[PDB]
């Protein structure tokens, strides 16, 4: 058996073909087992509609998840990603730095 804690990155991207659009991204990388729970948060509340959830693996024991959706952030709002995994005794919350 092997288990590996996910690395978690939270960042925003504008698709170059539609630059007014903005996407909040949680990239959860290098984890095993693949069982996982991932949410985007707005002011601490789960965002129910997340339009993209893309799972892959490299080696049979290394999984990657890109969890992302369109958003419209204001300077006062706080966004984050919350991850639950067997390796994480408490849910891990990684805040969006709004300059990322």
Numbering used by the authors: 0 to 99
From the primary publication:
Here, we report the use of the TPBLA to explore the role of the protein sequence in determining the aggregation of the naturally amyloidogenic protein, β2m. β2m is 99 residues in length (10.8 kDa) and has a seven-stranded β-sandwich immunoglobulin fold that is stabilized by a single disulphide bond linking Cys25 and Cys80 (31, 32). The protein forms the noncovalently bound light chain of the major histocompatibility complex class 1 (MHC 1) and is important for antigen presentation. Another example is β2m, in which aggregation of the wild-type (WT) protein is associated with the deposition of amyloid fibrils in the joints of patients undergoing long-term renal dialysis (dialysis-related amyloidosis [DRA]). More recently, two single-point variants of this protein, D76N and V27M, have been identified in amyloid deposits in the viscera or tongue, respectively, with the former occurring in the absence of kidney disease.
To examine the structural effect of other amino acid substitutions at this site, the crystal structures of seven variants (D76E-, D76A-, D76S-, D76G-, D76Q-, D76Y-, and D76K-β2m) were determined at high resolution (1.15 to 1.52 Å). Comparison of the crystal structures of D76E-, D76A-, D76S-, D76G-, D76Q-, D76Y-, and D76K-β2m with those of WT- and D76N-β2m revealed no substantial differences that could explain their different stabilities and aggregation propensities (RMSD < 0.6 Å over all heavy atoms). In WT-β2m, a salt bridge is formed between the negatively charged residue Asp-76 and the highly conserved Lys41. This interaction is preserved in D76E-β2m and may explain, at least in part, the protection of β2m from aggregation for these two proteins. Indeed, a recent study has highlighted the importance of this salt bridge for D76N-β2m stability and aggregation. A second group of residues, with a significantly reduced score compared to Asp76, includes the D76E- and D76A-β2m variants (∼ 400 AUC [P = 0.01 compared with WT-β2m]), while a third group contains the remaining 17 D76X-β2m variants, which have significantly decreased scores (P = 0.003 compared with D76E/A-β2m). Overall, the results show that the presence of a negatively charged Asp protects β2m from aggregation, at least as judged by the TPBLA, with the negatively charged D76E-β2m or neutral D76A-β2m providing some, albeit more limited, protection as judged by this assay. The native Asp was most protective, Glu and Ala showed some protection, and all other residues (including Asn) resulted in a low in vivo growth score when introduced at this site.
